[PDB]
Every structure is written in C-alpha cells, then in structure tokens.
Amino acid sequence: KGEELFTGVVPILVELDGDVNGHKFSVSGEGEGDATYGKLTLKFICTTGKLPVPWPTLVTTLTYGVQCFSRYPDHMKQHDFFKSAMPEGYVQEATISFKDDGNYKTRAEVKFEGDTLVNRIELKGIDFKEDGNILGHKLEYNYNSHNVYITADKQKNGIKANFKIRHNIEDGSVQLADHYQQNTPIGDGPVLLPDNHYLSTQSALSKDPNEKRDHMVLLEFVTAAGI
C-alpha cells in the first residue's frame, strides 16, 4: 500500500521546464514533505536567470505534484488516490486559464526515484498579453487560501480536480486563474477512486535573505476535507 511510504519525512525534487510566449525558463525545487501534518517546506530556484512570469502563477504547477503530502484524516484514508498510485506514480495534465489573458498547459509525472519523491514538469504558456498581469509582473508576492475540489474518473482509472485561484494584483484588484487538473496512474496496480471531497490549501511565500538568484521559499499546508 502506497500510504506506508508517507508515514515520515520524505525528500522532494521538482524540475520544471517552461515556455511562456517564447520566453524559455527552468525551475529547480528542493525540500521535504511530512504527510502526517500535511506539511510542505520547499525552495524553488530559477536556474536560467530571471523568471518571465510572477512566482505566484507557478505555485499550483510546482505544488500539484506534491499533493501526495496532503493530510488525509483517518476516516478519509480510503479516498487518498495520490498516495495509492505510489511508488509507480501518476501522469499529470493541467490547463490553467487566466481571465482576460493567456493559458498554461502542463504535463507532468510524479513518482518515487528511490526514497525521493520526484516531480518532472513541462509548462507551455500561450496567448499572453505583453502588458498584462502576468508578463507585466503586476501580481503581489502572496498566495490566498483555497480549496481543490476532487472528483473521480473511473473510465480513466484516475481523478479530476477543479478550482479557482484569485491572484492579488498590485492595485488591489483580482486576476482569476481557473484550474482543471487530471491525474492518471502510471502503474497497473489498484488505486483508490474517491468520493467527492476537497483539499484545503494554505500557502506562505517568502524570500531567503542570502539568496541572489530569482527564487521562492514556500511553506504549505494541505488537508483533505468534505467527508
């Protein structure tokens, strides 16, 4: 059973390759997750130089693959798809539509590489406005608390996730970002197909005072609820 691999602290590696309106970039993430408390401590670094998009627009993409660290209460343990697909893992597909702007289409794979949870991501962003909230860097360096609504897809032997992200613009306004996530297992083994529920997410963004590269330090708490 996959949940037995998450009883303690597990090291995490996130590698992202992106392209938004022709602007190519790479992000490397390192940290750890402790599913017993739904705790994620991560540090993401843009290894290609300056990030052409604001850091908050990438939080869901960079934390999507680590939803296996969500704290599922004991009474909800039969509803944990994420941990059940482990060690073999799952393929991730997401479409992030920014209101009155472009979209991000992501393809990722999350699995165990030894005793390390790895998330390899490819991001493709198109039709973004030059002086928009994204390419114009008009978004505040913060992240609002939200829910990730999960539904099962028995035909694909996986799950779906739907939620709205409201990014805070510097003028006090809001930039809506609708998310549609789809997860399909890599392995042939049995996975847990859940009833409708949600993941309550709280995220705190910060900077490392001694780090000179474009980066993002993240403290995140994810908890399953609804059942």
d(CA 92, CA 64): 8
This structure's resolution (Å) is: 2.0
Counted residue by residue, the chain has a size of 227
Burial of 93 (0-12, 13-18, 19+ CB in 10 A): middle
Tally of domains in the chain: 1
User: What SS3 state is found at 66?
Assistant: coil
What residue numbers bound the domain in which 186 lies? 1-227
Q: Are strands 158-168 and 23-34 parallel, antiparallel or unpaired?
A: unpaired
d(CA 104, CA 123): 7
Instruction: Please give the span between the terminal C-alpha atoms of the chain, in angstroms, as a whole number.
Output: 22
d(CA 37, CA 40): 9
- CATH code for position 202: 2.40.155.10
Give the residues across from 146 on adjacent strands: 201
- Tell me the helix, strand and coil percentages in the chain, rounded to 5: 10, 50, 35
